[PDB]
């Protein structure tokens, strides 16, 4: 019908503009994806009639590139949209059967390509885990209400015992980025690191609140729940130790609380 | 007055293998509440009983002292806290029999605990097992600097307590069982205070200085071990029919 052809025309215009901007955000230039392109993509995710699966597909397509720069930038763009985009974006990623498949990515173009490939593998793992974390609880741990009246401080015991290990698993994937400050020496890896830093602070806050809630419930828990809690507590200690190391790397390159 | 106290201390600490009798403990508690009772003389009577060579007399004098620290007027534990020395039983030995040998080990550990309980009280001028709890209580509202100084005091007291290190199959007479019941009541309450200190520290995570975070992390690491030990302590209690109803 005429109505259908007119509608198809608009959807074509829209799709092409998104794909083009994804390419712009993911050029071979060794710099983070440009703000103007990220802002444009964020706005796209907020348009009721933008096609989210097509947007995601464009980003996945860029991760099939052989250039570490294109691949890492597509991952950074995806992360940025998970954080700053409309919730429909992360929700779509959470609904998928598969996400990034980069565990064997390797760019052997040069020493920098080799070094960056390791970080691409670790970062891809983190974004997959971030999506699966969202799927399991239907919310983003880094965004929920905090404080005494917030989500993690008020959660019931049974749900809490299921939920803290999900936070722990996400935090592990995040910290396993395992970069040192002497390695944060190009705008691509630095852009990824800044997003990881913002996530880590917020994710740790949620983790910590979960632990506080569990400790408050100590005398009220069943014997077996106490055992699960103690295991959660013990694992939390090592993650707090690692978070302090992560914060030190950030401080060494001039990233601190002001950047949260 | 003094003679009546001394006599009752003796009755609380006879050679009979049974915990000190309630009627005598109640009498001593009332004594501590009499404005004109002499606390130092009461304490001295208890110390003198711990110079006895019988494990039964010595252990019962320690239990009587512990009972008064817990249930007596606060002037009693305050006086103990003010002393230059307390119990000196680290080499006590009633090598008169197997039971005497076995019990001597527990007397040494228990006396260490009571010394630590008094010194804990001295350092903060209150009893961790008695303070107001909950969101508006002492440990949940304490400021960061004081908290960092205070949790290690709790930890040190808890270590001396758990170091009693008894097994359920060693709890086989009314004397050691009376000491154990007091230790259990202290341990539950002391752990509640310890736990509240930890919660308060965790709440302050993002607000602490770098160095404070390091101190806090050490505190949290040590807390894990004590929680693990408390769990084992609670099982020993459960194995001899002591639980929450006995708190």
Author numbering:
A (entry chain A): 5 to 264
B (entry chain B): 18 to 264
Lines quoted from the article behind this entry:
Here, we show that the R-SNAREs VAMP8, VAMP3, and VAMP2, which cycle between the plasma membrane and endosomes, bind directly to the ubiquitously expressed, PtdIns4,5P2-binding, endocytic clathrin adaptor CALM/PICALM. X-ray crystallography shows that the N-terminal halves of their SNARE motifs bind the CALMANTH domain as helices in a manner that mimics SNARE complex formation. In this study, we provide structural, biochemical and in vivo data to show that the internalization of VAMP8, and consequently that of the highly related small R-SNAREs, VAMP3 and VAMP2, is mediated by specific, direct interactions between the N-terminal halves of their SNARE motifs and the ANTH (AP180 N-terminal Homology) domain of the endocytic clathrin adaptor CALM. Thus, CALM:R-SNARE interactions ensure that R-SNAREs, required for the fusion of endocytic clathrin-coated vesicles with endosomes and also for subsequent postendosomal trafficking, are sorted into endocytic vesicles.
If this hydrophobic trough were indeed the VAMP binding site on CALMANTH, then deletion of helix 11 would be expected to increase VAMP8 binding. However, a truncated CALMANTH construct missing helix 11 and the preceding ten residues, termed CALMANTH(1-264), unexpectedly showed no binding to VAMP8 by GST pull-down experiments and ITC while still displaying normal binding to PtdIns4,5P2 containing liposomes by SPR (data not shown). Multiangle light scattering (MALS) indicated that in solution CALMANTH(1-264) is in fact a tight dimer. This was confirmed by the determination of the structure of CALMANTH(1-264) at 1.7Å resolution (final R/Rfree 0.170/0.191). The dimeric structure explained the lack of VAMP8 binding since the dimer interface (burying 2100Å2 of accessible surface area in total) was the proposed VAMP8 binding site. As there were no other significant changes between the surfaces of CALMANTH and CALMANTH(1-264), these data strongly indicated that the hydrophobic trough in which helix 11 (when formed) sits was indeed the VAMP8 binding site on CALMANTH.
